[PDB]
Design a protein around this ligand. Structure first.
Ligand SMILES: Nc1ccn([C@@H]2O[C@H](COP(=O)(O)O)[C@@H](O)[C@H]2O)c(=O)n1
Length: 393
């Protein structure tokens, strides 16, 4: 009998956790492994250090049929150790269940580990408030039972169905916020149901790795030594969170770069509404899709250190390298931050948010307020901030 480990995630946070798992186990060069991590390209010179390492694409949040070709290479008794994104867990496991059903005499499921996509799961759970959660749970377990057979998907409640895997397999959920589950009154039947099958997502695994493994992990996640060192400087640090564009009544991208620079000044300069303090070392963390806007911001900002835009913000939490303060344009990344690290979150114009009032009603912001992670005073609408100049370098 042999174990095969599958690492599936279309997004970022689960993949970052899954790459940690792989790193933790990286002394084993031959354990069969299947990577379907859409956002992460494992470098060739890491891959060739391993045997029985396989790669699969995801298509509409499902591993392609190329998964069957890989699994056919192991014709004896196999046990699958599966790692999933919670939000997308149903779609991700479909081809696995189909395969198991075909080969139920020799293929079996060892266990599941499931990790939050991020704020998504929480936003989706809020929509379930005022349903009979106990009733939703039991129904989802029943419908999961049929899915288990054939690999046929039908769930009346797709959100709750994410949380009933324990009715079929050994499972461990890794939650961004256990406080959410323990404090949300309406979710008490779900929290009680999950029993000891969940834990808070651990951000400390990196500290127990060998130095060699730590470097391996950083390589996996596109975090080079220059950037790490910059984030090891023994001084107070502030990271500004850049964005792409918004509804500014212009399609001139230089405008959006200019305005983001104005927002940054409100943190860096004493004259700013949001002045962080004179003693902070300042960093710019551009949006991964900012493109040439990031170049403009970097070029015009003074006394600032770039953190390559392509790195997922959550890598910082994963590696213990979060700064003292984080501020700037709003992103779901704020959901995952300890409250003492949040300065001010600035919201830009879109269809849903045209004011501070609207920003306070943003789905992840509302949860954050209720959990006491942020005060209303920490929520700023972008065009409330006057034009200010920057400093000298
Ligand atoms: N300045 C920024 C903004 C977003 N991001 C990343 O992009 C992801 C998606 O952000 P949004 O939900 O705000 O679109 C986050 O999980 C975060 O990793 C980043 O790494 N740096």
């Amino acid at each position: 009998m042999k174990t095969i480990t599958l690492y599936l995630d279309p997004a970022s946070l689960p993949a970052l956790n899954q790459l940690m798992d792989f790193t933790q186990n990286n002394e084993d060069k031959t354990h069969p492994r299947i990577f379907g991590l859409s956002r992460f390209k494992i470098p060739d010179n890491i891959i060739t250090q391993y045997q029985n390492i396989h790669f699969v694409e995801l298509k509409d949040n499902r591993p392609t049929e190329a998964l069957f070709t890989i699994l056919d290479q192991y014709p004896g008794n196999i046990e699958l150790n599966i790692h999933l994104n919670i939000a997308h867990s149903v779609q991700l496991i479909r081809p696995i269940l189909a395969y198991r059903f075909k080969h139920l005499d020799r293929v079996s499921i060892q266990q599941l580990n499931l990790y939050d996509n991020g704020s998504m799961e929480y936003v989706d759970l809020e929509k379930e408030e005022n349903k009979d959660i106990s009733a939703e749970i039991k129904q989802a377990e029943k419908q999961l039972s049929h899915y288990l057979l054939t690999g046929k998907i039908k769930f009346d409640n797709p959100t709750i169905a994410r949380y009933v895997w324990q009715s079929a397999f050994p499972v461990k959920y890794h939650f961004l916020s256990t406080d959410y589950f323990e404090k949300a009154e309406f979710l008490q039947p779900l929290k009680e149901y999950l029993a000891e099958n969940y834990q808070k997502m651990d951000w400390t695994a990196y500290q127990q790795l060998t130095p060699e493994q730590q470097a391996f992990y950083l390589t996996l996640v596109g975090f080079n030594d220059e950037v790490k060192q910059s984030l090891e400087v023994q001084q107070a640090k502030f990271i500004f969170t850049g964005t792409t564009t918004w509804e500014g009544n212009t399609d001139v991208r230089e405008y959006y770069a200019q305005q983001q620079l104005n927002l940054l000044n409100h943190f860096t300069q004493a004259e700013g509404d949001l002045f962080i303090g004179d003693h902070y070392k300042i960093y710019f963390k551009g949006h991964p899709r900012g493109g040439e806007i990031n170049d403009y911001i970097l070029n015009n900002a003074k006394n600032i250190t770039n953190i390559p835009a392509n790195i997922s913000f959550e890598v910082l939490m994963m590696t213990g390298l979060l700064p003292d303060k984080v501020g700037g344009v709003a992103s779901s990344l704020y959901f995952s931050l300890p409250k003492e690290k949040i300065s001010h979150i600035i919201f830009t114009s879109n269809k849903q948010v045209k004011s501070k009032e609207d920003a306070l009603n943003n789905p992840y912001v509302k949860v954050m307020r209720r959990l006491g992670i942020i005060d209303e005073s920490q929520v700023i609408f972008w065009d409330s901030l006057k034009q200010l100049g920057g400093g000298l370098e």
